[PDB]
Amino acid sequence: NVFQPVDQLPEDLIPSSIQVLKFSGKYLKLEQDKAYFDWPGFKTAIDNYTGEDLSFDKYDQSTINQQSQEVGAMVDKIAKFLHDAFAAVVDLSKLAAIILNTFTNLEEESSSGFLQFNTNNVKKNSSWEYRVLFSVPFGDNAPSYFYSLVTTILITADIEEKTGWWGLTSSTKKNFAVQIDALELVVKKGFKAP
Secondary structure (H helix, E strand, O other): OOOEEEEOOOOOOHHHHHHHHHHHHOOEEEEOOEEEEOHHHHHHHHHOOOOOOEEEEEEEEEEEEEEEEEHHHHHHHHHHHHHHHOOOOOOOOOHHHHHHHHHOOHHHHOOOOOEEEEEEOOOOEEEEEEEEEEEEEOOOOOOOEEEEEEEEEEEEEOOOOHHHHOOOOOOOEEEEEEEEEEEEEEEEOOOOOO
């Protein structure tokens, strides 16, 4: 739906991880008929959280200026970033492939609830927001715990039309700009969404 769920958890945690999805989903802001994630709203909501199965770990944000590079390289960089900044997706079986697939299949995934296209008539360019939510466990040493990494990836390129994004390959080269927003939460089995 609002976030592509990417789980790698033991069945006894999947239910809790869905609640996290439910919770995250309620912070999408619709306007101009374009759906985007509400980070201020979401951040704020976590603070006011008065539960016990949820806690903030860290929030990270990386924004890189428009640079001409290939899709493959760019996704690899995004992946390396998510790998190095958090404990959550350290052993996730190459998120890079999950991310590279989303951008090389934009046309088939456009209607998906976790992708939002947009154009800038002034700058005559466009962008996509990919919303993804990762969940990986702590380990059998702390069975009730796992991490959830609420992530948004905003890719901007020098592409005028929406069709300009159709059929991108790992080799395709453009003037891409990338903004990654990711928040890591420590959640435990039994977490219900407010």
